[PDB]
């Protein structure tokens, strides 16, 4: 019953795509049918939900937003290693309401096309076109002709100095929507409290107790960060560092801290700062110099991370970071931490149930704003 | 000219100074690396009188507060530079849709395990109770970590859908159309002026422009990869390049990304993913399609690097990176229709620039 029906426009290389289909079939036994029906982008929303639509549709990204609005497309979830194989801006094109809803294939935009016999070296600027046209008109030619009837062609110029269709409103933390009190949080906290109730952990275990027990070889596992590594290195323990365990088949989501270099808005040296950071520091040699002095852990620069991640501990830090959440960069985090500290302690000890501790934390977090 | 850099005393500040010294050797500009106590508290105190360091190093989360006070300069790296760092690290230094710092390093909790006690650690939290029973029979325990601090316990709590504050995704704002602002008027006025001064004709359309270029009557045109084959058939030896700037800013062509979507109702979603990821989005897969009918520039970096040996493709990609992604919402239909009318009417004598854009603003909205 497994098969793939693929829709692509008749002006694309659908025979080429079929050849890829045939390779798939040869490897998997699964038959791939490539079709190019007329009006396929109109037909798709008509048939897709009924159980007679294609499995895969190829079209320009802009139409997929409308499809996504109707819930016609499956959220895709490629691994980080796969996402990194495509240009970031192409993933931006297939994002809707913060979800990836397609795979990017190809990229098209307008360019400046010029006659090399008439103009061996074309102009850099729009402003130089009037004079260039005067010069060419003296030989009975013109500088520039393009389609003025269709805004697609004239928009690039119009947009240049601040024209736009729709303002993209940036993503934002919503401080009135706290998630300490939902089903997911209750499940995780209940598992934790149950580990305590069942005597697999003690409620009063803290940083030092855990560190000592691990470094003295009394416990098989601990949860900690790169700051703890050197203390373990000096111990007798042969340790590894790995991805955190899943809970209900989902990754554990540690908060991620990103050591960042900000440029003072009042600095008269902003161009120097940019030059230093981009071209001296954020290079393999620059990060190496810093790392050698005191380890950075995992780094944001791909080329150097690929070198550092030969150490599995660094690889694991990065893997956990990619599965985690970026620490929110807002003042209200203080209220969250305080409320949550209390909730876990009270649940861990039996002073409150899980539901009442999280309920109280939800109300405290919001009220402390 | 100089650079004073602040970084915490627990970081590799001597290493950073060595980088500073290399900068000085090349530029003649001295870099001073300092690690004052409480530097993250000091910065908003002295930056806000305007006498602080030029560069400050700290964890990204503190920079949100700084950015709220306008203490940090918006950074604008080129596309080629942004691509050198992991996307998610740029997300960490974004505030109100602006990049406010450069990401350096990445820190997170991991599972640390004793290889002599446990050569292969558990993949699941659920398997820990049984593992602990087994280890307790030898006088050991499975797992000990800091239960007092939510930083350490949150990973588990978050796993099944706990979160601090809902991040509401970025979104096109349909009540905010920008066809009628100073920038749009500037661009359109320059265009109308090209017409008024007889450097272009109001009536020029796709076919007229294509014919004139392909017959060697005009030095330049603006067009996409779809037009190339018709030029190839002409006598004209052509090049393809980056669009001209206007007021020293890039022309921003709309970018179309040919995309493959998976039907939400499909019972074959895992097959689709396998086909797309591991057969199609590879060099050999894209080559098969490309050989049949050219794709132009491609999203797959490894194959784009091969295709971009053709300067025309390189130029398409360069323009695409400087352009704007075509908004993926239905309301674009209203924008195009309104704007089509505005440009035609301004280009002709039929309306002024201001009145044509004003009418288009009102037509787009609704």
Author numbering:
A (entry chain B): 5 to 373
B (entry chain A): 6 to 371
Tell me, in the authors' exact words, what the paper reports:
Here we report two passenger protein sequences that promote the formation of an intimately interlaced dimeric form of MBPeng, featuring the largest interface area observed to date for domain-swapped proteins.
To understand the molecular basis for the observed dimerization, we crystallized the protein fractions corresponding to the dimeric species of MBPeng-KFLFAK and of MBPeng-KFLPYK2. Those of MBPeng-KFLFAK belonged to space group P1 and diffracted to a maximum resolution of 2.0 Å. Instead of a tight β-turn at residues 173–176, the protein chains adopted an extended β-strand structure, crossing straight into the second MBP structure for both MBPeng-FAKKFL and MBPeng-KFLPYK2. This structural architecture produced an extremely high contact surface between both chains (~11,300 Å2), corresponding to a calculated solvation free energy gain (∆iG) of −174.5 kcal/mol. Following structural refinement, clear electron density was only found for the Asn-Ala linker and the first (in the KFLPYK2 crystal) or the first five (KFLFAK) passenger protein residues. The Tm of MBPeng-KFLFAK monomer (60.1 ± 0.43 °C) and dimer (59.0 ± 0.49 °C) were lower than MBPeng alone, demonstrating that these particular passenger sequences further destabilized the fusion protein.
